[PDB]
Amino acid sequence: LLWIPNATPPAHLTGEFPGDRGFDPLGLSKDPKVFARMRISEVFHGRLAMLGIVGCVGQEWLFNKGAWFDYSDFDLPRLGLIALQVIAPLEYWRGNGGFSWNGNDGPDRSYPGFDPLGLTTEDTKLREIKNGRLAMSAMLGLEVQSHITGKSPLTNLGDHLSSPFTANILT
Amino acid sequence: KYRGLWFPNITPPAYLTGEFPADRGFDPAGLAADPKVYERMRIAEVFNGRLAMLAIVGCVYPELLGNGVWFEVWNKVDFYRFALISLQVVAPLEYWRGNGGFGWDGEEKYDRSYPGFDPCNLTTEYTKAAEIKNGRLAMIGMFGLEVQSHVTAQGPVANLIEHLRHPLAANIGANLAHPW
Amino acid sequence: GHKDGVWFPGATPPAHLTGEYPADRGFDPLSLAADPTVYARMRVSEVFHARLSMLAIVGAIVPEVLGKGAWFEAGNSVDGIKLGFIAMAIAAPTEYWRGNGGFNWDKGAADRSYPGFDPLKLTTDYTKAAEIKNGRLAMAGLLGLTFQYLATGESPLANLAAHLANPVGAN
Amino acid sequence: AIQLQPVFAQWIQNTHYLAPTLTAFNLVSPTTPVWGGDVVSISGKVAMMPIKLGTADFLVHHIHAFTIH
Ligand SMILES: CC1=C(C#C/C(C)=C/C=C/C(C)=C/C=C/C=C(C)/C=C/C=C(C)/C=C/[C@@]23O[C@]2(C)C[C@@H](O)CC3(C)C)C(C)(C)C[C@H](O)C1
């Protein structure tokens, strides 16, 4: 499984860890420990992006709140202060690995074991990674689309669906 | 003695073995590492819990009956008389609870956590765990009531009914986004 | 092992406190430091609470001396929410780095209480025991400033100006 | 007198009446007048109109639950 026809798998990535399709052209994960951190960061960027994309489409589609780039409604420093106070111990404990000062105890800091239904395997890890990459792509799309089309992403989908050959990337 | 833990893959403290009801390996702040304190903590946990269970029914039920809200009771009721008369009534009862009996030296050695006031012989090491868990739930609840009292300034049944009627316009997010 | 004495005339030190760590005066009636791993953490927290209190009791007084109002009038002179947001946004990396003992994912194993910032080489046992001593004052002081403002309602320095001209009739 | 109000069914009725504004957004009017609103009347005669529930509705409903059980 490769990202283009036969680009020779770069030797830092062999194919043990899920989501390997032999990419890494810049060789950013040439060292094993930086690869380890990159893996954490990939899955975490993924999971946030998936919440984010559901967030932005859901608020405009399902809850009729309006476009996601409208921020004039609420006071941003207040939400920021609240959000940072709430997120601080949770993002410390995640990075830490637990609650102790020397804390590297207990669970894994990428897969901490919050599965009631017991559905964690290599395949589901791959599925998580693949949906994460798609969501990251989508979230980048939303930002760039917001700055080029100047209107809501569902409005963008409306314009492509109405007339795809006239309304596309060469707007 | 298999027992569950409060957080997935953690390891329990070594002084929490499961020897006592409703142990879930939860003492990160190490407040029960010494055994004699763990004895008192155990009595305190059951007693704070029992009082929170009484409190939370006491707070909810007169508001359900339309007799008033629990944190507004002190404009119809004088606090200082209530608290004087209550401490007069409670004092010999609390005394005897801590004492272990009526005698000056304890004498009639009773359990000060689990006396025998049980006519149905229902006491097991399971019902003990149920009493603890219901109590912990009520303590968390009474914390909720107090914070909700300050933030929303309405009663708890009113707070529930508001969430049910307008779940998006009456929740912690919306109530803390505004000055409150 | 207590050369420098104890908190109460004839008191026995607790069993976990054996005069080994700085500024131990054998004071733990609630036995919060019985577990050693917890006491290791407790030590760092006390020193940090101490170092934060000393910058705070200065910051509550030294502005007032230069005629800027008291500490409870600082809300008039700044935008309270906004500075609170930038404080939380700047504390987030630096507190994480303090806790992690470095910048890398897999911890650092630097002393996270006493990191090594000392170009004057004053790091001695006396100074460690004076950090905590001056610290315990400043915490007690800050506990005063709050309770003085709740019982009175004038400025901190005004309460001192009262007590010299009103020894009997201060309380 | 001593009221027994069917508060769950009232809650459900209200939610069904407000549905066209959030939870069934692309719908114009609610599914029926029963949930609330105005009287539909063809010529003089009433086609449909809101059906309100109170103590009497509570007792009959619990009689129904009894006889089915
Ligand atoms: C792998 C590799 C390479 C690469 C790469 C690539 C393509 C990287 C791409 C990265 C990418 C594309 C990362 C996106 C993340 C998006 C996130 C986390 C956003 C969350 C956003 C959230 C949490 C949104 C929140 C909100 O929206 C909500 C819900 C409502 C709004 O009202 C308010 C806000 C906005 C707050 C190289 C460099 C090419 C060579 C190397 O060799 C190997």
Q: How far is the CA of A97 from the centre of ligand 1 (A)?
A: 24
Resolution (A): 2.8
The helix (H) or strand (E) run that includes residue C125 is helix C125-151
In sequence order, what E strands does C63-115 have? Answer: none
Helix (H) or strand (E) holding D45: strand D45-48
Contact B13, B25 (CB under 8 A): yes
Does chain C touch chain B (at least 3 C-beta pairs within 8 Å)?
Answer: yes
Cβ(C134)–Cβ(C57) below 8 Å: no
| Alpha-carbon gap, residue A134 to A105, rounded angstroms | 33
Tell me which residue of C89, C41, C124 sits closest to B33, measured CA to CA: C41
Q: Is A139 in the pocket of ligand 1 (CB under 6 A)?
A: yes
How does DSSP assign A80-147, residue by residue? Answer: HHHHHHHHHHHHHHHHHTSSSTT---SS-SS-----SS----HHHHHHHHHHHHHHHHHHHHHHHHHH
Locate B59 and state its tokens.
Answer: 């707070």
A74 touches chain C (CB under 8 A): no
The angle subtended at Cα B68 by Cα B64 and Cα B73, nearest 5°, is 135
Instruction: Identify the CA nearest to B138 among candidates B25, B24, B57, B22.
Output: B57
For residue A86 and ligand 1, the question of a CB distance below 6 A is answered with no
| Assigned token pair, A9 | 């798998």
CA distance C97 to C108: 9
Contact C54, C41 (CB under 8 A): no
CA B139 to chain centre: 4
The SS3 of residue D40 is strand
Closest ligand 1 atom to residue A45 Cα is 18
Q: Categorise residue B110: left if φ over 0, alpha if ψ from -120 to 50, beta otherwise.
A: beta
The number of beta carbons lying within 10 Å of the beta carbon of residue A99 is 16
A-chain residue closest to B30, CA distance: A100
Angstrom distance (rounded) from CA A76 to CA C85: 10
Question: Does D touch C (3+ CB pairs < 8 Å)?
Answer: no
Q: Vertex B28, ends B22 and B34: CA angle to 5°?
A: 75
Residue A71 CB: number of other CB atoms within 10 A? 9
Rounded to the nearest whole angstrom, what is the distance from the C-alpha of residue A27 to the centroid of ligand 1? 20
The residue written with tokens 């809850």 in the block is A63
Task: Provide, as residue numbers in chain B, all residues whose Cβ is less than 8 Å from the Cβ of D14.
Answer: 165
Angle at alpha carbon of residue D56, lines to D54 and D59, rounded to 5°: 110
Whether A140 lines ligand 1, by a CB cut-off of 6 Å, is yes
Ranges of H-type helices in A16-97: 32-61, 76-96
Q: Which structure tokens are listed for D63?
A: 């009689």
Can you give the three-state secondary structure of chain B, one letter per residue? CCCCCCCCCCCCCCCCCCCCCCCCCCCCCCCCCCHHHHHHHHHHHHHHHHHHHHHHHHHHHHHHCCCCCHHHHHHCCCHHHHHHHHHHHHHHHHHHHHHCCCECCECCCCCCCCCCCCCCCCCCCCHHHHHHHHHHHHHHHHHHHHHHHHHCCCCHHHHHHHHHHCCCCCCHHHHHHCCC
The helices-and-strands tally (H runs, E runs) of chain C is 6, 0
Which of D57, B18, B32 is closest to C38 using CA atoms? B32
- Nearest chain C residue (CA) to A87: C92
Spatial distance between the Cα atoms of B36 and B44, rounded to a whole number of angstroms: 13
Residue A140 Cα to ligand 1 middle (Å): 6
What CA–CA distances, in Å, run from C131 to C94, C113, C124? 21, 12, 11
Residues of A in contact with C100 (CB under 8 A): 95-96
Structure tokens at C125: 């046992």
Contact D47, D41 (CB under 8 A): yes
Interface test with B, best of C16, C28, C32 (most B CBs within 10 A): C32
Buried b (16+ CB within 10 A) or exposed e, B4-32: eeebeebebbeebeeeebbbbbebbebbb
**Long-range contacts, B155-163 (Cβ 8 Å, 24+):** B155/B63, B155/B69, B155/B70, B155/B71, B155/B72, B156/B59, B156/B60, B156/B63, B156/B70, B157/B60, B157/B63, B157/B64, B158/B63, B158/B69
Instruction: Find out whether the beta carbon of A135 lies less than 6 Å from any atom of ligand 1.
Output: no
